């Protein structure tokens, strides 16, 4: 906790760098997660689900 504080939080430059890097990760992973979840709740309905017939 001291270590974590000292590395990522104490210097604002480091805190902002950590926040921005986390936002980058969040953005990419959240995108993938929602895409999969959306495809499951709307299964068999979307073009991607019927495309194979054509």
């Amino acid at each position: 906790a001291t270590t974590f504080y000292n590395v990522f939080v104490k210097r604002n430059s480091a805190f902002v760098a950590t926040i921005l890097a986390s936002a980058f990760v969040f953005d990419m992973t959240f995108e993938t997660a929602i895409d999969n979840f959306w495809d499951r709740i709307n299964a068999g309905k979307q073009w991607k689900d019927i495309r194979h017939k054509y």
Binding site: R11, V16, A17, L20, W47, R51
Partner: protein
């Protein structure tokens, strides 16, 4: 017996000197990283960013290699 105090004037400019600036060099580094990450994040959507930078990153880079099937593309 000491006749005079012992000191020198270090070079300075606009109220900065090398001892002080050297303490901040690492901080400029981290700010530079923060600015780099932030800039790259802002243009992550730009196709050239993906093509030239993001898709080349090992392991992770496949996140940005996505093709529309030719059957689904009017253009």
């Amino acid at each position: 017996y000491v006749k005079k105090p012992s000191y020198k004037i270090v070079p300075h400019f606009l109220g900065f000197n090398i001892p002080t600036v050297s303490k901040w060099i690492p901080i400029f580094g981290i700010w530079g990283a923060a600015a780099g990450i932030g800039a790259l994040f802002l243009i992550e959507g730009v196709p050239r960013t993906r093509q030239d930078i993001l898709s080349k990153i090992p392991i992770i880079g496949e996140h940005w290699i996505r093709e529309i099937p030719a059957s689904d593309n009017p253009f």
